[PDB]
Amino acid sequence: IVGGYTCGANTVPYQVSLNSGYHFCGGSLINSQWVVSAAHCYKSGIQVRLGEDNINVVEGNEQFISASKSIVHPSYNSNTLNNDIMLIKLKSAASLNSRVASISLPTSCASAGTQCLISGWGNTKSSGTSYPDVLKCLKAPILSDSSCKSAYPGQITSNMFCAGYLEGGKDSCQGDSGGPVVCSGKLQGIVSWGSGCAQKNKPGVYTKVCNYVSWIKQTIASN
Ligand SMILES: [Ca+2]
After folding, report:
1. Residue 134 to residues 120, 192, 201: CA-CA distances in angstroms?
2. Are 19 and 54 in the same domain?
3. Whether 3 and 113 share a structural domain
4. Distance CA 159, CA 69 (A)
5. Is there a binding annotation on residue 62?
6. How far is ligand 1, taken at its centre, from the CA of residue 75, in Å?
7. Are residues 68 and 172 in the same domain?
8. Catalytically active residues, by annotation
9. Does 175 show up as a binding residue in the annotation?
10. Domain that holds residue 185
11. Residue 172, marked binder
12. Tissue specificity, please?
């Protein structure tokens, strides 16, 4: 997250870190056994880390649970990142508590202009590299479809939305991929892609989770 703030330990209790020997992507806990992330975060051998603040210190509220299964969307296209969503099943249910908690899936799609909370352990520099140890947060508004298509001509599908600031300076970034975009208390986006981070006229692009609720529900009813 570039231009964000330190969230505060466990104030984003549905945020997970995906670890393959190191943090590589975020995700969102949607119930005690399942995490939503981006399909471009797929790796074999994923451990889900819940209850994290500092990803480099064991502070006492973590649960580390191996994934048993990962399910990339059946229509994921890694070239265009259309349908950039994945489900990850935990080998054992998380113990839900004040610091490890699920986020609701949406009933309705979020509105343009809504300010959402985006979080993660990704790079904090627009130019260069610096990865934080503690979770960062950003409030960013959803942009209109026509603004998002003007920013990325011939690249935005109906399963993507843009959020952020066209002036630059505030965005999600590498290492935040797969993490949540929460709007009015529901998981509405997944950190997916963008041209650089926090560059002028190049806002973040996010997977539109409200288009996938039927898939998520039928997949979790079957696995
Ligand atoms: Ca920790």
Report:
1. 9, 21, 28
2. yes
3. yes
4. 24
5. yes
6. 34
7. no
8. 40, 84, 177
9. yes
10. 1-12+103-210
11. yes
12. Synthesized in the acinar cells of the pancreas.
